[PDB]
Amino acid sequence: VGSVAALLTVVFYIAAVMATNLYGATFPEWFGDLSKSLYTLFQVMTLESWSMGIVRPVMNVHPNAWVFFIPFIMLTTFTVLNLFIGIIVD
Amino acid sequence: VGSVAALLTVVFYIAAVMATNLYGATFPEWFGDLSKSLYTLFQVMTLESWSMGIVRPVMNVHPNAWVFFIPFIMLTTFTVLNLFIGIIVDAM
Amino acid sequence: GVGSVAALLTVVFYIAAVMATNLYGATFPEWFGDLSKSLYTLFQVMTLESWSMGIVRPVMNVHPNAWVFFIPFIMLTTFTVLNLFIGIIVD
Amino acid sequence: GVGSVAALLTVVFYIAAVMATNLYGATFPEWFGDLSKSLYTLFQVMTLESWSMGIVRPVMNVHPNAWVFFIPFIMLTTFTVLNLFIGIIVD
Ligand SMILES: CCCCCCCCCC(=O)N(CCO)C[C@@H](O)[C@@H](O)[C@@H](O)[C@@H](O)CO
Ligand SMILES: CCCCCCCCCC(=O)N(CCO)C[C@@H](O)[C@@H](O)[C@@H](O)[C@@H](O)CO
Ligand SMILES: CCCCCCCCCC(=O)N(CCO)C[C@@H](O)[C@@H](O)[C@@H](O)[C@@H](O)CO
Ligand SMILES: CCCCCCCCCC(=O)N(CCO)C[C@@H](O)[C@@H](O)[C@@H](O)[C@@H](O)CO
Ligand code: NA
Ligand code: NA
Ligand code: NA
Ligand code: NA
Ligand code: NA
Ligand code: NA
């Protein structure tokens, strides 16, 4: 559980660093700095407007953006589910 | 389960009191009174338009509003999941 | 002449903005929360930009008779502006 | 005559587009990221299409005094265009 949460923090911070570099200049409201990127990737993890609100507008500039966002969702959503179940069982 | 539901009610009511004070004057449609705040925080808990519809517009006026809403989601979402699983287990 | 028309529009914009802040400022603080915000919104209403779908219909869900304020304001300002612009061309 | 008015509008559109790219290009790259994008957006602003709900209100959330740029631009361009179009009809 402790290591699971530690892995989720490392993944989250790395992805937010990656996103700031990739989409920061073209999408500064969602990825303009590390703080904006951490907030946006938390929203994308909760699946809230991830495609219509964020990734479809981003794909209009960066057509391969789905290679970043779909594996991010698959990874964080699975880990969050695994972590919350882990706390309840332990 | 009973205590879990009791904790969720106390958390929900306290947060709705907090939100009415914080965002009531600047966002009266969503937090103008305790009834509006309880409804909005139920919507935020279900994750429905929580960021695009509510917290991003709120952050344009109150930049630190994420310090309220992200811990609220993390807490209530985890508790609801824990409560629903608890009812199912204490039935089998 | 033109000067009196430009002054008339200024007075109308000030009176309507004070009134809009007073009536709708508590319920709609983004568009009418203070004189500056109201002056900006009333200008947007005069240009007919989202005046109904974006401003007046949301306001009427709280203040049902709000159309009595905004429809006469549109009728007055879009007439005054039409008269002012044609007035400058003639003179 | 008409030629000088059409040239005046061209110069104004170039100066405002360079200024809009310089001021708002980093924070709003879709509408002001370069001269081409700004020229397109300023034309859209002149036609009064979503100028406030779609462009200026989002910009003012980052640049609060942005209204001092866009409101005088609208007042100037919608006047020049009105004078130009009436000018062609007369001549
Ligand atoms: C799972 C771990 C989740 C961690 C989430 C951390 C979020 C931190 C957000 C933050 O520090 N902000 C700056 C507060 O000063 C908010 C930004 O996102 C904000 O600048 C933008 O959203 C603007 O566009 C709003 O006007
Ligand atoms: C569970 C398995 C999920 C698999 C998901 C695969 C997605 C593959 C998407 C893809 O290959 N695109 C083309 C990338 O070249 C993206 C398209 O959506 C694209 O045609 C455009 O809509 C955007 O690029 C926006 O303009
Ligand atoms: C008489 C002819 C019309 C003249 C219009 C004058 C507008 C002056 C607006 C002003 O002084 N502001 C303060 C900043 O300089 C603008 C803001 O108060 C407001 O427009 C928005 O920022 C809010 O609606 C955001 O919620
Ligand atoms: C050129 C002549 C234009 C005259 C316009 C007269 C409008 C009269 C409107 C009216 O009498 N209302 C009743 C209350 O005063 C308002 C409502 O009928 C309506 O505008 C909306 O509030 C609804 O659509 C909401 O679902
Ligand atoms: Na969902
Ligand atoms: Na949605
Ligand atoms: Na949704
Ligand atoms: Na329009
Ligand atoms: Na429109
Ligand atoms: Na129009």
Name a few traits of the molecule.
about 0% strand, Helix Hairpins, about 90 residues, binds sodium ion, homotetramer, binds hega-10, mainly alpha
Question: Mind sketching the topology for me?
Answer:
Four copies of one chain form a homotetramer.
Chain A: H1 2-23, H2 28-31, H3 34-45, H4 50-59, H5 66-89
Helix pairs in contact in A: 1-3, 1-5
Question: Summed up, what is this model?
Answer:
Chain A is built from 5 helices and no strands. Chain A is an all-alpha fold and 90 residues long.
Strand proportion of chain A = under 5%
Task: Say what the CATH topology of chain A is.
Answer: Helix Hairpins
Total number of β-strand segments of chain A? 0
Radius of gyration of chain A over alpha carbons?
14 Å
Tell me the number of helical segments of chain A per DSSP (H or I, 4 or more residues long). 5
**CATH architecture heading of chain A:** Orthogonal Bundle
> Mind summarizing the main beta sheet of chain A?
none
Distance between the termini of chain A: 9 Å
What is the overall silhouette of chain A? elongated
Structural class of chain A: mainly alpha
Biggest interface pair, counts: A-B, 11 and 13 residues
Count of discrete structural domains of chain A: 1
CATH class descriptor name of chain A: Mainly Alpha
How would you spell out the order of helices and strands of chain A?
HHHHH
Oligomer: homotetramer
| Small molecules bound in the structure, each named once | hega-10, sodium ion
Residue share in helices of chain A? Answer: over 70%
Organism (chains C, D): Magnetococcus marinus (strain ATCC BAA-1437 / JCM 17883 / MC-1)
Protein name (chains C, D): Ion transport protein
Subcellular location (chains C, D): Membrane
PDB class: transport protein
